[PDB]
Design a protein around this ligand. Sequence first.
Ligand SMILES: O=C(O)[C@H]1O[C@@H](O)[C@H](O)[C@@H](O)[C@@H]1O
Length: 329
Amino acid sequence: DKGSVGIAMPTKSSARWIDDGNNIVKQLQEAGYKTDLQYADDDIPNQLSQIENMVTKGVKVLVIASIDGTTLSDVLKQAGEQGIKVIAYDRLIRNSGDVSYYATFDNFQVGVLQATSITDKLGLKDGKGPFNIELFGGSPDDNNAFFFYDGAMSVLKPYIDSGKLVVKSGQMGMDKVGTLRWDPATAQARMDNLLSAYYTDAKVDAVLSPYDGLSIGIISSLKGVGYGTKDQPLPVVSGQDAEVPSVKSIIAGEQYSTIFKDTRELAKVTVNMVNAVMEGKEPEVNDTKTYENGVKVVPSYLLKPVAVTKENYKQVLVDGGYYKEDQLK
Ligand SMILES: O=C(O)[C@H]1O[C@@H](O)[C@H](O)[C@@H](O)[C@@H]1O
């Protein structure tokens, strides 16, 4: 037979990975492969055990979206010893030469888009400012978080340097703005304490949020101190993943933007890679320079993300079939 593919997803607490998993499995099975899809509920030891089982089971290919890829070094070595090819899915797996390919969206560009939605809304290109902004990052054990952050700062930093953007808290850098495990409650708490320490007098004009789940928590915090009223509008808040609650928030004129990353397209890239490996061919890659993982630069294929606001949500999210119309009502 064609062989089996082991698919390891990190959690279901962030909505996308259910879609990733469903789409990867649907497309792999259509392609004639057997699949073993597992979700780790954000438990690092359990994800490792799940991957060990796939290796022991003798899958031909592993597709892994890791909570913390650095913990997988030994199991990926074992996979390599058995001739199993490893595709890092969405998040780069670091500290392992046993990672063959990396399928993802253009993570730096995601950051550029997140920051640009904010700077465009604030009218910074038109010389407006100063405005107060606070920064959030993803989980520091997620290689993507650094790219989202760096991508955003490529747009933001020039305005911070010129004073047209002011980080009133002074908190910058992933070691200070990172949100462990991409946890909304954590981000909401940080927002609470940013507001009380730095914005009891002044107002926040924007918040760089790298993920929809965080955006919603950040917004709750802001409403907690009086934002989101007619007199006092919410600051401009970005996002990622186009989760339903965030899309509803955008439609309602609350959260400002998000980033659409079509998991159907990422699954398709993944199936193309699996097919190539099975056929003894080289997978198509479009970036062999960016994704250093500590041991090597993993050959990667990057998909182009799409910024979404209340202006384009229908065309981007509904007309293209990602969601049904009624899901957003
Ligand atoms: O866990 C999360 O929320 C985030 O994880 C990142 O690695 C994904 O690229 C992003 O799409 C998710 O929003």
